[PDB]
A paper describes a structure:
Here we demonstrate temperature-dependent changes in the structure and function of TRPM4, a temperature-sensitive Ca2+-activated ion channel. TRPM4 is widely expressed in various tissues and has important roles such as cellular depolarization, cardiac rhythm generation and immune response. TRPM4 and its closest homologue TRPM5 are monovalent cation-selective channels; they are activated by intracellular Ca2+ with a weak voltage dependence; and their activities are regulated by small molecules and lipids. Like many TRP channels, they exhibit pronounced temperature sensitivity, with activities strongly intensifying near physiological temperatures.
Author numbering:
A (entry chain B): 766 to 810
B (entry chain A): 7 to 25, 33 to 48, 59 to 80, 87 to 178, 182 to 386, 393 to 480, 500 to 514, 557 to 710, ...
C (entry chain B): 406 to 480
D (entry chain B): 568 to 648
E (entry chain B): 1135 to 1177
Amino acid sequence: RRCLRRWFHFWGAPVTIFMGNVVSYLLFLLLFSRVLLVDFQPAPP
Amino acid sequence: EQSWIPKIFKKKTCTTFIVTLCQCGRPRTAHPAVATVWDSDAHTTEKPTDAYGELDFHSNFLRLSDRTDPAAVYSLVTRTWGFRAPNLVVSVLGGSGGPVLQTWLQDLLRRGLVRAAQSTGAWIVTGGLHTGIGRHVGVAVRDHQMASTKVVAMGVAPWGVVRNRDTLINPKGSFPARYRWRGDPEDGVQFPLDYNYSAFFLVDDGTHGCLGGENRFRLRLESYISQQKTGVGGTGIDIPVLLLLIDGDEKMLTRIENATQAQLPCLLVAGSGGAADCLAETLEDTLAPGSGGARQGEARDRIRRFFPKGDLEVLQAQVERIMTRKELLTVYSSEDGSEEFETIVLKALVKACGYLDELRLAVAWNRVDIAQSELFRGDIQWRSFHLEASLMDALLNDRPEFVRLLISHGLSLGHFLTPMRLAQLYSAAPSNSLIRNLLDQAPPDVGHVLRMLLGKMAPWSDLLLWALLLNRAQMAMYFWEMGSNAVSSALGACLLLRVMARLEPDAEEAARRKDLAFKFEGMGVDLFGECYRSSEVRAARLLLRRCPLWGDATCLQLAMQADARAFFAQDGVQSLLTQKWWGDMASTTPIWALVLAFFCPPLIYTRLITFRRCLRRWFHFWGAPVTIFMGNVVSYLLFLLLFSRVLLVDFQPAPPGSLELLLYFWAFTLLCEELRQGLSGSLSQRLRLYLADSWNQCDLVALTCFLLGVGCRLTPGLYHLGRTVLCIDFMVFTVRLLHIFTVNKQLGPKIVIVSKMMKDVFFFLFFLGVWLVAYGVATEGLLRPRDSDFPSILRRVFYRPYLQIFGQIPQEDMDVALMEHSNCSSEPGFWAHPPGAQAGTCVSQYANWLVVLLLVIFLLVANILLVNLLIAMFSYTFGKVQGNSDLYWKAQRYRLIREFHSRPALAPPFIVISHLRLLLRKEAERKLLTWESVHKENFLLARARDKRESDSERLKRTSQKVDLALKQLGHIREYEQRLKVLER
Amino acid sequence: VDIAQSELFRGDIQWRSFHLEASLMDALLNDRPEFVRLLISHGLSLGHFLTPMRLAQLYSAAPSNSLIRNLLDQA
Amino acid sequence: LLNRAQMAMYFWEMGSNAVSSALGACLLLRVMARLEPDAEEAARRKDLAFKFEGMGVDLFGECYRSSEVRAARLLLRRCPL
Amino acid sequence: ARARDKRESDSERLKRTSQKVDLALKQLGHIREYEQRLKVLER
């Protein structure tokens, strides 16, 4: 399918993989910060 | 590439056979089962060829039948095989009995023939075999090529004589080919192909070996090639084809007779041997007396040629037929080995033709020296049409050396250039070219093309325009030197080349146009510099004058639109711009003097400012761009002061007072002035250009927030939001003071450099942002404050670490040793109470030595390492971009000065009056051109003299002179030795 | 090289295929870049010249304790 | 392999693959330079490698400016030799 | 192009001029010997 080929072309490009990883890493740091500052407690995780 | 070759070219097989051994040469047993006197047409059948391909010893080869149309062959060589069209074809005949030739003969081939063929880009068509004259030509080509530090030679050989025919046979095609020319057996039945030749034509006649089967095809090919025209279609002359004969035999006299019947010049080498000197002596007889001359030919045939066929009258009859067309025959005068081949060829060609002209032949080849000698011949008189026809050939074929020489020999360009002549020149656009496509979209109709490119903005001017469009760099160079307008033409050429460079589909071509544009821009700089230093006043009149030929626009307009930064960077242009900046007042007027006159209008009539007469002086002062700039600067500062007073004091929730209404009216006139600039600077296209500029974007933002803020303050519930927008709005308005002061020479370059520094700032922010997140979160996580409110967390993570860079370190908020210990929190651990309000109610004491350590590391990395790194990057960037930024501002200076010239003289607070007024609504020139032209010739002469006196040119001239000494010395040695032997 | 150039340029003298082949090895083994260029330009077929026996001799020219020689010995 | 700089120069000019050969020659010379016991010889191999790398730069630059598309196909193509 | 640039370089032209001058000197020396011998023989 031409639509499927275009879909894989966009998400298979190195730049979009780089952008996807950068966005994911920033979200990971935000989750890490939220857990450390607030969600961390002596209670079980 | 190989698909159509078997389709059009037909190989020939024996088919029916007549005899064991057939008369066709094939074995009688080795024949098809279907198989008086053997006939090539009757006894053979035609099948698609199976030997086409490229040889590797790369050289091309092909198998073709004798009865083949030469037109298909010529198209294959010129287009498919990539060989260039020949400017000359030398058909080197020759029997050359014995593997070794006379020393002068081999000298003539290597020094006279091959050198001439390489110089004129000619073709050499001999038998493509390692025997006879073919080997001697091949070694001559190889010997010259090695010593030259490539000649194109074609070989026409009969199939059935080539050694190792089988390895070449491949019906699909053999693009790589393996051949063996070092075969151990040595027999005269078959010969190998010569490795020096570039292309081969294995003519097939269904024979397993014979000589002379390719003569019919070879003669047809030479005759057809002589019918083609040299270069750019039919404009050029017919391709000259001549036959060179060395020695020979009885069969070769038949070849000469056939060539003359085909109207082909023949060049006979005197003293070569039999079948060549026989015709040379016959030509030497010329108008021999009738008595005692008839028997001379018969005796000469027996004397020169071999005894067989001498008694037979066919030889004498054939020679008699040869002399019937003796106008085509010339004899190579030995002249003790003249080796001056090209001149003898020219004499042979012009004599044979009896239209073709000697000058056209020189233009057809790339030999300027031949044309120089022909033109310098005082005895020969040249007609006007002789120069006119030759000049077109140089112009169409892009020969800059010839057109310069032809013009210098008293050629009237005015009568030469005609609309029919001009149409042919523009028809020379090569295939898919930018000019060709524009002409197709657009009689040449060139005027329509120029208007679309430039946008509405003398034979020499037309030729310069033609050369620029076709990207003939050297031709455009020559035409500019002979033009009347030069400074405007140089800038106009730059605009045309640069705008067409943006439209170039090929990146390689666009580089050439940009390269040529840089040359034209430089010469406009050098020429104006020479003109300026002689007379500043006359040079100024040159720039502001309107050149009617280009667009009736000044040179400054052309330079500004062509982005000629180098043209604006010279002192002459900058000094003129400063003079236009000050208007009628002198450029040396002190700034403080201008300020005093501005505040005191009566002072302008006194003598402190140097320039109805009183009314004219009044309008001169207030109409000058500098006073308009000063009036706008003073008005803008007053606007900011009024804006500040309204914001800080006069702003109230009550309906607007008198001062606020004045501010609204003041801002309204500012919007009108900004709108007026955008309108006059294609409504849709103008709006796109206006929004593109970054400075216009901030201006649009500034007025947008003002409209939003004013609306909010009038709404009863949005008073607080109204002030907040205006407070930010004042920031945008104050920033615009930088844009206003871009014109000033002291602050202009510096403001432009600041923009180039933004890349370094963004890197510092990214590095600082990463470090702030890492340190801020870790410190907050270790402290674990009990407030933990989201705004409070953000402040302690980003705001507090940020302020520590600038010396605000709250030790009492992060150090346990400073705060007091308390049991505030019920959660297990040890806690201390910070004294700060936003530091949190309590913080953990568990590992505060790490919190202190992190602060030490943070201060080192941020306050020292990061800040000092940015200083290093700022210093490096400032040094790099200093030169380019200065050039950019200098180019931009003219646009800013011109903009202030069109602005109303009234201040923005009073500009509503001017806006309302805007609504409801020679012999000296020729002398200036002559003065410009005189400086151009002096500038060009100095450039030529410097090149001639350059060390490289003296070395070149000494080398050539030494060559002439060597030729003279060698002649002396030969002459002295011969004379000494003769006198002994 | 000039002597070889004059000898090769002599049109009267005819050179056999093995005459060029034997000479070309001598230039190759003795590291004479000027000669091999000249010999190749005079219609020498490199395809027939290079043989595994011919190739073996070329690699045998590694000078005494050389890096290639030690690697060949280990191989 | 025998570090004949001028001979390796001539053979590269007559070869079919040139851009790949120039880079391949650089890899071979540099890797064998690391294995050289003599420091003087290792310098000569590194010197010859720099010459081959430059010509690969000059040759590709000439190829690129004529046709970017064809030059691109040259780099990503696999050289079997 | 590389070969042509080297050939047209100033150093190469100087080298070629030097060799050509040498060939002139050899030719000139032969002329002097030949002219003197012929003049003596013809006298």
